[PDB]
Write a new protein. Structure first.
Length: 107
């Protein structure tokens, strides 16, 4: 569902717990294609709480297996992303997504 390839290693010990707020930088693109979003270019980290279905399953499960400081390439299959419906106007049906995610801190 989500494949994780490490860009930079974390501490290897500090992982997100259920109900914790994850602070991340991300860049998102369609596989081998167009970039659709970046928190890095606007210099504003993205915050979400784990275990609250706030983000796509691929990102949730990608961040959940990352330690603090880790940066990774997340390849997210459509079923762990926006599926056959897509995201209106931005993400097509059956789109595999690539997120470059850095887990900055947990709060
Ligand atoms: C302008 O930028 C948008 C985000 C854009 C939307 C379009 C996509 C290309 C994208 O560019 O982000 C993008 O890169 C993307 O695909 N993202 C964002 C980064 C995390 C991964 C993914 C995602 O899951 O987006 C999310 C995706 C689009 C929809 C969710 C997917 C998972 C599913 O379980 C949810 O059903 C509920 C819906 C959008 C979000 O990350 C926002 C934060 C979360 C929600 C809207 C819901 O969780 C909602 O549930 C009631 C909430 O609890 C929120 C906090 C309540 C308040 C009022 C809403 C705030 C909305 C903020 C919107 C923001 C910052």
């Amino acid at each position: 569902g989500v494949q994780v390839e490490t860009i930079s290693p974390g501490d290897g010990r500090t992982f997100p717990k259920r109900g914790q707020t994850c602070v991340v930088h991300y860049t998102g693109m369609l596989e081998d294609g167009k970039k659709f979003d970046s928190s890095r270019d606007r210099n504003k980290p993205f915050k979400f709480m784990l275990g609250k279905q706030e983000v796509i399953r691929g990102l949730e499960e990608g961040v959940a297996q990352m330690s603090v400081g880790q940066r990774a390439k997340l390849t997210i299959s459509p079923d762990y992303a926006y599926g056959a419906t897509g995201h209106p106007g931005i993400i097509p049906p059956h789109a595999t997504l690539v997120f470059d995610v850095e887990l900055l801190k947990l709060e």
